[model samples]
Target: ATFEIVNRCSYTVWAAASKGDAALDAGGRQLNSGESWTINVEPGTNGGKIWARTDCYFDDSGSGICKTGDCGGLLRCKRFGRPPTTLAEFSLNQYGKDYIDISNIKGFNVPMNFSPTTRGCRGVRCAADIVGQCPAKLKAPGGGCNDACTVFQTSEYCCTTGKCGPTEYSRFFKRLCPDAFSYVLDKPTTVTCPGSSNYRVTFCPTA
Candidate 1:
């Protein structure tokens, strides 16, 4: 599947994608507002993701830090960019189906909309002003919202013992971005689709 990443946010965005330890799109690309990039994803790929890094400064070698979504401080990330960052995750062609979701399980750094470009498919979006609405405890210092699981680190939020349940904080995220996976045990956020359709990820999307 082809992935088109668009930056509609009002700030600078360093777009990043990865498949395990390998960097895709050479790790990252600097995209200004209204700019976009496209990449290809092969079938049978699992745990592949696309995200954006904001407020970054890198040297000629692409080594530096982004205020949000920093991946090992490397512009071209070899690791999954850190949590507290919105993720458009994909598992392609597994069991004859493609699974996709806008996961906030790690938290959120930006508004996003994920959709199939081909006809006859639905799209999911999380374009709320989560940053502005974030509680101080859950707000990122650099920007974005942190999930309760990441903030409190308790079983109540973490769900380590399988007795997990959503709370006010999780509900905060769910309330804002209902289609996004607000917590680890969130239900039905996953969208099953076919590999035949190309997809697009829009950052800071309009609601």
Candidate 2:
């Protein structure tokens, strides 16, 4: 895919020790998707000669942390400084060249602090019993979905009764988007604990 090169890294790939004329830091200027500009490269170049660049995005698909495109849809570059890299299916080239393999970035398999599960709280494991604490529940734009209205601590109340889960929701509300409490607490509750309404925020990486 064709993309305007916006160098924001310490290294230079093209254009006189800079990302590009409009690049950040007096070189590249931030641009929204669909912005148009000319790409300067060896004339008559095609195929892998040009690569689209992007900022990194975290995973949100109930999977473990590692900057993934799993649950979270493709997160277009939208930050500053370090540019996004590739693990498979995605990569940002300094000059948008095709030489670099276009794959997604599978961030190191380490636990991230800000990950939904680890952020505001830890994973939900029943006190004992081997029963999962939170399960899953989701509603839409209408109707009275209690999942998005009430907030609690344990999944017991939600499990026996029909309300929202406990753990995951609180985690997301407190960790991911604290200010967006209403959003997390209303009309959009997704996962809950087992036998309950508590949200399950963490799912350690699969082997």
Candidate 3:
């Protein structure tokens, strides 16, 4: 399986992807405007995630900070990016299909689109301007919007207590991007495609 990550935004974006204990890019590289990188995943790769880090400043030693989606302050993220990030989650060859989704359950930092580059697959995307239209109370300090669970940490938002439905906050996000996973109990964001299909993860799809 392969993922073609494309940066269509005007500014640079640091891309990160993780599967098991390994990173797609052991030493993270910046994708300049209109640049792209192709990542080859291990056969039958499952439960992998790809995301973008914005507003990063890295030093010679590969120590840096990102405004959003910082991964332990490391150039190569061996783990998931912090909240307020747009995520592209995938599991290849699961139940004879490929599961994919553009998630915002952790909250959205940037707009992302997940599309199969191969034939016989539909495209899924969350290209809303979430940060600009984020509710005041759910807004992160630095940037991006916060999930209701992160902001209030209540059972209604977290859906940990029981089977919970969408709150006003979750609805706010859902209204903007119906394709994304707005809340914990939000319906399955996963979209199944043909196995072994190549995908394109694009940041700022509207750009």
Candidate 4:
């Protein structure tokens, strides 16, 4: 499957993606405004996510950090990014379908849109201004909002145990972006598409 990472924001975005230990696309590379990068994923690849890091600085060896969504202080991340990041998650060719979602469960640093390039598939997006509307307690020092799990780290917020429902903090995210995953175990957030279909992941999609 092929995916396009499009930077629609006004400034530069450092795009990152990982499928297990392997990186994809221009992993840890700069995507200037209006620039787009294409990632070719092998069939049946699963458990991968894409996100953008803002306010980043990288030196000669691609070793530096970002203000938000920093991944292990490296340009080519071998692991998942830190919280307060807008995530575009995917599990492709799973049981004959592709599972996809935009997640704010780890909080949001930027807006993202996940849409299929092929016809007949529905699009899902979360374009809310999370940094601007972030609650005081969950607000990050630099920018962005924190998920309840990240803030509280309790069973109630993390849902590490039995059945748990959304908290006021989670509801705050849901109220702004109903289509995205606002908390763990958010059943209504996931969507499925036909396997091998092309998709577009747009950062700062809002005009």
Candidate 5:
């Protein structure tokens, strides 16, 4: 699959793709407003996580800090960074099906749309003003929001226990992004499509 990443944010965004121990695009790439990058995903790839970092600065050797989603201060990330970052996740060619979702389960930094470019497929987005409505405990210091689970970490919010359900905190995110995985059990929100479909992941998306 050809996975396109577009930065439509008013600010620059550093994109990272984490496929377990591997890195995509040599770990990460910078996408200023209106800039775009493309990466390929081979079949059988699973549990892929892609995200954007905000307010970042990397020097010649690619070491710096991003206010949001900092990945060990490396220009190329070997692991998914700390959260409070919006996430785009995918699993390709599993049982001949493709899966995609825009998640704020780690909380949101930027609005995003994960839209399939193939016919008969659908699009999903998490583009609400969550930062503005973010609860005090859920607000990350860097302007992006954090999940209640990140703040409280109880099974009630984290679903670490085999038995758990949504609370007001999860509802807060769900009300804003019904398509997002507001709670761990919300995995059903993941979108399913035909394999080999192309997709565009947009940041700070517009109508």
Candidate 6:
């Protein structure tokens, strides 16, 4: 959105609309090719104009839309304005026309509202973790502590420590060792426990 003095000797000198708003580049400050100017279209001020453009998106007509998605056409008819002007001009790249009216300018959207959406849990590892606990290796029973054995659980069934089911080691494996454990294609294999510092990597390969 942009404005330039059309007729210096006109009745509506300065900006005819709300000129002090920050959204307008009325300051007439220097700007780079892709820069924006903050205009001040003060009410009842002497014959000054304002302008704006947006580089973010274009309009349906294929012209540069203001950042607000408005696109004004060439030589659009001029409008009348009054004092106590607010919400005067916007970027031509989005909203093209200069809001130069008294009521419409003041009545432009104000006090904006916003809302956000929710997302789901990402890395819970539910499926892989459930593999442990169930009786017998699901795959290689008696084949050296199956990856399924890595899960953490407390029960009197563990027998030995009577501290009940699997020791702390079992919990860590299920919670964190599936990456190092074997995946069955056809051959029977064991879960690796080389116990390296970085436990995620495999300690054994079929060779």
Tens digits of per-residue lDDT for model 5, 51-118: 99998889999999998888899878878878798889999899989989888778888899989888
Off by over 4 Å in 5: none
Q: What is each predicted model's overall lDDT from 0 to 1? A: 0.84, 0.23, 0.84, 0.85, 0.85, 0.23
Listed in order, each prediction's TM-score against the native is 0.94, 0.18, 0.94, 0.95, 0.95, 0.16
lDDT of 3 at 105: 82
Q: In lDDT terms, how accurate is model 2?
A: 0.23
lDDT of 3 by residue, 34-60 (tens): 998898876577778888888999998
Which residue pairs show backbone clashes in model 3? none
TM-score, candidate 3, is 0.94
> lDDT at 55 for candidate 3?
91
Residues 93-200 of candidate 2 have per-residue lDDT tens digits of 224322222111111111111111112222211111111222234211111112222323244423434554444443432343222122212333222212211111
Residues 110-139 of candidate 4 have per-residue lDDT tens digits of 899998897656878999887888899999
Task: State the lDDT at 42 in candidate 2.
Answer: 30
User: Candidate 3 regions off by >4 Å?
Assistant: 25-27
Candidate 6: Cα lDDT at 165 = 45
Residue 9 Cα positional deviation in candidate 3, in Å, after optimal superposition: 0.7
Position 70, candidate 2: lDDT: 18
**What does the lDDT read for residue 38 in candidate 3?**
90
Is candidate 2 or 5 superior in TM-score?
5
The residue-level lDDT of candidate 1 at 111 comes to 89
Residue 107 accuracy (lDDT) in model 1: 83
Better of 5 and 6 by TM-score: 5
Extract clashing residue pairs from model 4. none
